[PDB]
């Protein structure tokens, strides 16, 4: 054949740290359907947002938003443990059906995204070139996000532990910790990897009593 009816751009969802994760690759022949399991970013998270994106950029913010929905009623669990199955189905009419189902709670939510949604031909061409020009910066962004996410996780687990421990935590310590937390929080807003890991270290250095208590 000289003619194929395809998705012109990758389709996916936003994941932790502002990353685009692809469910259907660009130039996939329609009709098509693909599924992938995701989980929760933080411990005891009760809900997730599914932000449907079209584009080739690793940075979610630089891709085209097609729609969003929430899935709630996720039961308490450590982060990474729930199983949220996300399915993208594009039919012969080019309508995109996106669903998410929580395997534990059995809850599901869906949207339908019409064929005419997203980027037009000119925009598609721009997007492909854009992605090509930024391939290296996007690889670096991915690395950054890994560290950022480790940092967010430490931030969240430290906060929880402090609370859990409340009174048994010496005021000396809780002052140093609140400061370190804030420092870490700031660092996270930057794109310096080392600076993030360094702030995480500084938090760890002031958390030893917390760790003992918590443990």
């Amino acid at each position: 054949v000289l003619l194929l009816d395809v998705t012109p751009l990758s389709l996916g969802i936003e994941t932790m740290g502002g990353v685009m994760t692809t469910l259907i690759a660009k130039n996939t022949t329609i009709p098509t359907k693909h599924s992938q399991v995701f989980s929760t970013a933080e411990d005891n998270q009760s809900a997730v947002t599914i932000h449907v994106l079209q584009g080739e950029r690793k940075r979610a913010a630089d891709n085209k938003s097609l729609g969003q929905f929430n899935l709630d009623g996720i039961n308490p669990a450590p982060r990474g443990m729930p199983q949220i199955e996300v399915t993208f189905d594009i039919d012969a009419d080019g309508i995109l059906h996106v669903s998410a189902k929580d395997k534990n709670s059995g809850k599901e939510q869906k949207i339908t995204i019409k064929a005419s949604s997203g980027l037009n031909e000119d925009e598609i061409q721009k997007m492909v070139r854009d992605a090509e020009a930024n391939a290296e910066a996007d690889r670096k962004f991915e690395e950054l996000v890994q560290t950022r996410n480790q940092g967010d996780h430490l931030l969240h687990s430290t906060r929880k532990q402090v609370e859990e421990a409340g009174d048994k935590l010496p005021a000396d310590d809780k002052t140093a910790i609140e400061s370190a937390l804030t420092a870490l929080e700031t660092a996270l807003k930057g794109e310096d990897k080392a600076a993030i890991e360094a702030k995480m270290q500084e938090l760890a250095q002031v958390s030893q009593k917390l760790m003992e208590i918590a443990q």
Partner: peptide, 9 residues
């Protein structure tokens, strides 16, 4: 492998 989803809003 296993990617994580943000909370709403």
């Amino acid at each position: 492998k296993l990617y994580a989803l943000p909370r709403p809003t």
